[PDB]
Amino acid sequence: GGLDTVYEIAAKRLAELGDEESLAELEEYYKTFKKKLKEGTISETTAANSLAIMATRLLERAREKA
Amino acid sequence: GGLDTVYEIAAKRLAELGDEESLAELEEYYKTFKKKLKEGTISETTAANSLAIMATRLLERAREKA
Amino acid sequence: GGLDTVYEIAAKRLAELGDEESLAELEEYYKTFKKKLKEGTISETTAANSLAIMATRLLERAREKA
Amino acid sequence: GLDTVYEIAAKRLAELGDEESLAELEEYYKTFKKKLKEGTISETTAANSLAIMATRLLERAREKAHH
């Protein structure tokens, strides 16, 4: 639930800002975190935190380059 | 009320820094987080954490502008 | 426990780095979270997590100033 | 959890060529381990906090990655 929600919020906003490269980067990080979360080698909190942090800087980059 | 508490801390500090646009960004994220919690696709703790992460970046930007 | 531990680690580092303003900001955030947790308006996970978010940003600012 | 966070972060930071991020991460990991043995923090919270700091270390490692 939470990881998907963070990812969806970030992806919707990155698409609105028109940043294809940030969208692809975000998808890569999300997929990686979904695999690490699959194996139980990462808590849900850690996955959500890390995805939110890079999605935050990617969103900052989107607001500038626009 | 964790999400509300994080939101209040961030909004108070952004208002202190005189950054109205960051205040509007923060509220937009806060409204989105509530709709999501409302739909049950995210937990209160995760929503609060993610809002705090984005708010931390907003506080950095708001300070640079001051 | 966890909130105190995060706070103490960050405060020790901020003092080592000589950043009085970041130390005071961190203390303000910690006191706010202690009050909010007393009042039951924030989860323990959110308080510790958010203090870690802000403390990492404060440490970045401290190493940049130093 | 704490060991896993530390090992993942150390692998990535070593790949990126940041000896200084590796040293900072090791310091944090060791501190978290003293706090755990002294029982003033739980393993889950310690792992989460180490992951947060490691994410910042990784962002900076990638910042030297290019320019």
Which residue type is seen at C18? G
DSSP H or E run through D19:
helix D19-37
Distance CA B7, CA B27 (A): 8
Which residue type is seen at A61? R
> Closest Cα of chain A to C52: distance in Å?
11
D55: closest chain A residue by CA:
A50
Size of interface C-D (CB pairs under 8 A): 38
> Closest Cα of chain B to C16: distance in Å?
22
- Can you tell me whether residue A42 is helix, strand or coil? coil
Identify whether the C-beta of residue A4 lies closer than 8 Å to the C-beta of residue A55: no
* Stated length of chain D: 67
**CA A10 remoteness from chain centre:** 6
Identify whether the C-beta of residue B11 lies closer than 8 Å to the C-beta of residue B25: no
Distance CA C47, CA C34 (A): 8
Distance CA B65, CA B19 (A): 8
Select the residue of B5, B44, B56 nearest C36 (Cβ to Cβ). B5
Distance CA A27, CA C47 (A): 29
Distance CA D52, CA B39 (A): 28
Half-sphere CA count of D21, side-chain side, radius 13 A: 26
Select the residue of A43, A53, A57 nearest D1 (Cβ to Cβ). A43
Percentages of chain D per state (helix, strand, coil), in multiples of 5: 85, 0, 15
Distance CA D18, CA C57 (A): 19
Identify whether the C-beta of residue C50 lies closer than 8 Å to the C-beta of residue B52: yes
Q: Is C15 on the interface with B (CB under 8 A)?
A: no
Select the residue of A1, A4, A48 nearest B49 (Cβ to Cβ). A48
CB contact under 8 A, A44 and B49: no
Q: Which two tokens stand for residue A49?
A: 């935190």
Q: Which residue has the tokens 């960050």?
A: C10
Resolution limit, Å: 2.2
Residue B5 CA: distances (Å) to CA of A1, A20, D13: 22, 34, 35
Which residue type is seen at C52? A
Distance CA A61, CA A13 (A): 12
D43: closest chain A residue by CA:
A43
Q: Where are the beta strands (DSSP E) in A1-66?
A: none
Q: What are phi and psi of D29, to 5 degrees?
A: -60, -45
> Closest Cα of chain C to B29: distance in Å?
16
Q: Is D45 on the interface with C (CB under 8 A)?
A: yes
Percentages of chain A per state (helix, strand, coil), in multiples of 5: 85, 0, 15
Distance CA B64, CA C7 (A): 25
Q: Which two tokens stand for residue D62?
A: 């990638």
Identify whether the C-beta of residue D5 lies closer than 8 Å to the C-beta of residue D47: yes
Widest Cα–Cα separation across chain A: 38
Which residue type is seen at A43? S
SS3 per-residue string spanning chain B: CHHHHHHHHHHHHHHHHCCHHHHHHHHHHHHHHHHHHHCCCCCHHHHHHHHHHHHHHHHHHHHHHC
> Closest Cα of chain D to C45: distance in Å?
8
Q: Is C52 on the interface with B (CB under 8 A)?
A: no
Half-sphere CA count of C38, side-chain side, radius 13 A: 6
